[PDB]
Design a protein around this nucleic acid. Structure first.
Lengths: 116, 64, 119, 217, 45, 99
RNA sequence: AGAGUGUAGCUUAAAAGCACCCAACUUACACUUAGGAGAUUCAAUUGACGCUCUGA
């Protein structure tokens, strides 16, 4: 009740968010939303690398927005996957980038291009 | 007319500005577990409980 | 004759019983309790108990669940609690090890359905 | 206190050749190939190999083999490039192709007056220039070659403070994209070492702890 | 650690057979690719 | 454009009759289960080695930045400032045979 | 050389509870199910074997 000492023991909308450039003001330097294009000749290798990079993202407290993909191209077919990544620090950028560099299985190229 | 509470406010220590950096309820089971340990814990308001209430053996076990 | 807490309708579990079997499958040990309405533990069956732990390969599988099902069905036979009201959540009810637990309850002699109160 | 500025760099070579698989990895890959064969769905090459042979048997009772054979001979034609240019040389530390399945680290002997130390490549900087610029100057000056390398950030990787007038050493981490390494037999003592010979080359506590920020994999 | 994401599996159910053809684009770099009509060597002109 | 290539081709519906025989032996599935158990062990070992390397290099870089802050008051502000050359960053995967 | 010390990753847990991984559904994540590995550093509260910091 409004007048009891236990007022608002059950409110929850202050704990729920009921609802892009980079944030570099003066000291906390932050990436925006990323787009990592994992392009490969094989669905299996690209899918597995997307799964593993997603599992390293969710185990290192990284916000992942989407895990979508664009349609393939006729040439041999080229598959790819897009993993959007937000949440890094400069040391964490170096470490996460070098882990991605050192985790490449076979002939899969990388990208860290921004949105649009 | 708001009065200050008697004891500690539950769900207050976790109230941060960045809830996304805190690790999250992925499941349905962890929540009922945590609610069970706090429901077994006493509180300062009125609740349901107020009205309705050596080495050798270990080594041998490890070997077995 | 005695009352059951017939309410608690909106919230899970329902408290309309006399003795509750609650199984928590932890990372390492699976345990099954039989309780009163007071929250007090009447009958315990744990794999944190060397007499059943030393006869099991792994403390968590379908085998350990069947073993502790036999153990607790026996325990309720020497404890005189003969009737049950058990509520599993629907994803766990489709699990194989705890439906083997339910089969163990049925073959042991403890019915998973308490009789209705006489009014 | 007169403070002596020393910057440095830890050069990294990405492995062009992947690591060879474990025999137990070969076994589970064989099991995976078995289950991929088991869970596939009437694909067209076996339609041109099994049912065509059944129809030929029906015609005779009243080519896939040649294609597989020509595939085998074209496999035998193009000889695979050897993954091991490592054991045949066994002493060519001056070349970039000493190892392929691991990362390789530039590492130079240096002569002081009071010391003679096999050091990770260093340089001297003044506070006017950026530390990233110091690392770029180190790459462009110390090896006198034409590598095109790439950094990740300006954050350092390994800090060591040794004194005799204090002195500090900061260790960055670069990445070689490409390189024209003309005159590989230089007069310097640059040696690429994967992980192990660091412990054979770098004894003191300011240099035996370099491997804790080097990507061992 | 260049073998973590090479030990894979087709997560779909309606998929055909795949075989490891070695492919070279233009550079003399043979790479295993899961593909149909199991060629053994490849070269893009 | 919301067009994807995850749609199953229409040829995979008619002639699913080529391997109706999935039969194994008890030793084969015993070895398969042992392989699954041991490979869960090896994947846990690989990830825990990766976590050990990760925590070691995280603490090394954090200590390096902290000592750079206490030894250089005008360089730790630019030691976190990011580089504008990381937008078109490219790296291809490994190969087998050298050129 | 001295100090702080010490249960698998974490415990004002006493051989546990959360962590972690593979297999299945998921483009993918997540849930769930099936499985798995785990430890009180060695001797009689004390000494010494392992780590960190402070010295040369």
């Amino acid at each position: 009740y409004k007048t009891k000492p236990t007022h608002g023991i059950g409110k929850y909308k202050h704990l729920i968010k009921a609802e892009v450039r980079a944030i570099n003001l003066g000291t906390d330097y932050e990436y925006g939303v990323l787009n990592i294009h994992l392009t490969a000749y094989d669905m299996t290798l690209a899918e597995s690398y997307a799964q593993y990079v997603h599992n390293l993202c969710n185990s290192l407290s990284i916000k992942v927005e989407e895990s979508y993909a664009m349609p393939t191209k006729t040439i041999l077919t080229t598959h790819e996957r897009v993993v959007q990544i937000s949440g890094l620090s400069a040391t964490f950028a170096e470490i996460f980038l070098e882990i991605i560099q050192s985790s490449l299985p076979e002939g899969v190229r990388l990208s860290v291009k921004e949105h649009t | 007319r708001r009065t200050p509470p008697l004891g500690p406010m539950p769900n207050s220590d976790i109230d941060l500005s960045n809830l996304e950096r805190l690790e999250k309820y992925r499941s349905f089971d962890r929540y009922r577990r945590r609610a069970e340990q706090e429901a077994q814990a006493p509180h300062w308001w009125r609740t349901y409980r107020e009205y309705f209430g050596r080495t050798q053996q270990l080594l041998e076990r490890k070997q077995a | 004759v005695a009352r059951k807490e017939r309410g608690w309708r909106t919230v899970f579990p329902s408290r309309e019983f006399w003795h509750r079997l609650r199984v928590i499958r932890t990372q390492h040990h699976v345990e099954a309790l039989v309780e009163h309405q007071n929250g007090k533990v009447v009958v315990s069956a744990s794999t944190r108990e060397w007499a059943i732990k030393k006869h099991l390969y792994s403390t968590r599988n379908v085998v350990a669940c069947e073993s502790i099902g036999r153990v607790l069905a026996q325990r309720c036979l020497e404890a005189g609690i003969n009737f049950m009201v058990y509520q599993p959540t629907p994803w766990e009810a489709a699990s194989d090890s705890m439906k083997r637990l339910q089969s163990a309850m049925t073959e042991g002699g403890v019915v998973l359905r308490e009789p209705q109160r006489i009014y | 206190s007169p403070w002596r500025l020393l910057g440095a760099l830890c050069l990294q070579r990405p492995p062009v050749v992947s690591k060879p698989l474990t025999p137990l990895q070969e076994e589970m890959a064989s099991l995976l190939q078995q289950i991929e064969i088991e869970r596939s769905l009437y694909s067209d090459h076996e339609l041109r190999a099994l049912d065509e042979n059944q129809r030929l048997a029906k015609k005779k009772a009243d080519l896939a083999q040649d294609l597989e054979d020509m595939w085998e001979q074209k496999f035998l034609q193009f000889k695979l490039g050897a993954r091991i240019t490592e054991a045949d040389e066994k002493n060519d530390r001056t070349s970039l192709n000493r190892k392929l399945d691991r990362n390789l680290v530039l590492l130079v002997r240096e002569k002081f007056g009071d010391q003679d130390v096999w050091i990770l490549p260093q340089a001297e900087w003044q506070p006017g220039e950026t530390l990233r610029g110091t690392a770029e100057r180190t790459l462009a000056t110390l090896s006198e070659n034409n590598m095109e390398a790439k950094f990740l950030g300006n954050a350092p990787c390994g800090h060591y403070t040794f004194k005799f007038l204090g002195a500090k050493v900061f260790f960055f981490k670069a990445l070689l994209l490409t390189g024209d390494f003309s005159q590989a037999g230089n007069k310097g003592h640059h040696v690429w070492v994967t992980k192990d010979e660091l412990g054979d080359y770098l004894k003191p506590k300011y240099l035996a702890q370099v491997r804790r920020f080097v990507s061992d994999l | 650690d260049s073998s973590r994401a090479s030990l894979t599996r087709v997560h779909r159910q309606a998929y055909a057979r795949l075989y490891p053809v070695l492919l070279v684009k233009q550079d003399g770099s043979t790479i295993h690719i899961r593909y149909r009509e199991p060629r053994r060597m490849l070269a893009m002109p | 454009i919301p067009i994807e290539d995850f749609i199953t081709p229409l040829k995979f519906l008619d002639k699913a009759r080529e391997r109706p025989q999935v039969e194994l032996t008890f030793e084969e599935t015993e070895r398969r289960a042992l392989l699954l158990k041991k490979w869960s062990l090896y994947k846990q070992q690989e990830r825990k080695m990766e976590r050990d390397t990760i925590r070691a290099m995280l603490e090394a870089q954090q200590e390096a930045l902290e000592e750079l802050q206490l030894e250089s008051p005008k360089l730790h502000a630019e030691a976190i400032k990011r580089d504008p050359n990381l937008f078109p960053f490219e790296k291809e995967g490994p190969h087998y045979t050298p050129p």
